[PDB]
Design a protein around this ligand. Structure first.
Ligand code: MG
Ligand code: MG
Ligand code: MG
Ligand code: MG
Lengths: 217, 219
């Protein structure tokens, strides 16, 4: 048997306190909002969330933060969500701010199964990381980032999990699909295998574990 | 400089002795055939070629090798081309066999401006020879450096007049990868179309990294 097919109700079973979860979406755009809602309703806490940003208090992973479900955020920008900053300053939540280009490479590094990469980026800046001197230059050594789970939004998805995306909504989605131990997809459209043009598939079904089969109606 | 459009004859003007060239293709598939023919006809030599493999004696970059135009090959497989091995043994050609995943990441780093990366691939084996390892979190990793080239010869499926490209899955392989890691990029498209004709969601290689496009069709 072992189907990848499942419902939002089944999604609940994949959530547990303290897990690390990667979530797609750029400023809420391309965020698997239904999976995020299921995560919120599950009631799990002490989560570590990895995402491009914390969007707004009501979008992206904003609701999870506002409702106290998150212990740590790793993202590239939190300026548009005052609740993220507030919990950061109140000591209620740990926030690790990472430059976007570097955050993207760390997640890519984790999905590639590598041990780290050398960036010229951040040198002489704010430290805690080690430097490597190679040839004539100095480099900052950044480590890979992986997660227990990834919540992905896709445009089209076939029953095997091959995914395509719309430009704006793409962002972190294909990246995190490779860097999490278990991957859950919320597709705009679910179709039979063979229906997607192979030349345009972005994310291989091989890395997709579960697919939400319902439509928001 | 107000145009990326050119002919195969114009391609000859980019080939110089001793340059490093990245070439697309998987076992000969997805290789920009005509650009490689031009390269061979140009008679240039002492070249360093970077590709997934050395194909067969009569396909991909194989002819460039049999005709002594290559001093060094950096690839992940050379077994289907006996001439590569022969020249490696005789000392006629330098050959650096790189694990495929590693070769891919080296080229990706070259295109991304990174200084290198740590990989578990090859640690504790002959692949370590001549490189440094580094131990982090109790694990030992091999330090690999980025790869770039002077030129990249790319085969694309569809290409618009600005250089935006799409590929057929079966011929894609290294093409989009090398497009980002070379100083100058030349594309041999199956179909050249007007800008606006390609669906933006389907563009894989942005025209910004593409310098010249072959306009003629067929072999
Ligand atoms: Mg595509
Ligand atoms: Mg997996
Ligand atoms: Mg071979
Ligand atoms: Mg360029």
């Amino acid at each position: 048997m072992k189907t990848k097919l499942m419902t939002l109700q089944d999604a609940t079973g994949f959530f547990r306190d303290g897990m690390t979860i990667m979530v797609g979406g750029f400023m809420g755009i391309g965020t698997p909002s239904r999976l995020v809602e299921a995560l919120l309703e599950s009631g799990v806490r002490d989560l570590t969330l990895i995402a491009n940003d914390t969007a707004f208090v009501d979008t992206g992973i904003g609701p999870l933060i506002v409702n106290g479900r998150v212990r740590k955020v790793i993202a590239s920008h939190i300026g548009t969500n005052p609740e993220t900053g507030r919990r950061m300053i109140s000591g209620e939540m740990d926030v690790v701010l990472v430059p976007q280009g570097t955050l993207i490479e760390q997640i890519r590094c984790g999905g590639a199964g590598l041990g780290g990469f050398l960036t010229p980026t951040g040198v002489g800046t704010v430290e805690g990381k080690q430097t490597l001197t190679l040839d004539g230059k100095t480099w900052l050594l950044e480590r890979p980032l992986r997660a227990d789970l990834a919540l992905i939004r896709a445009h089209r998805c076939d029953t095997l999990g091959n995914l395509t995306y719309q430009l704006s909504a793409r962002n972190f989605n294909p990246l995190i699909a490779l860097a999490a131990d278990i991957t859950l997809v919320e597709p705009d459209e679910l179709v039979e295998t063979g229906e997607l043009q192979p030349d345009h598939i972005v994310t291989p079904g091989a890395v997709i574990d579960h697919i939400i089969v319902s439509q928001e109606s």
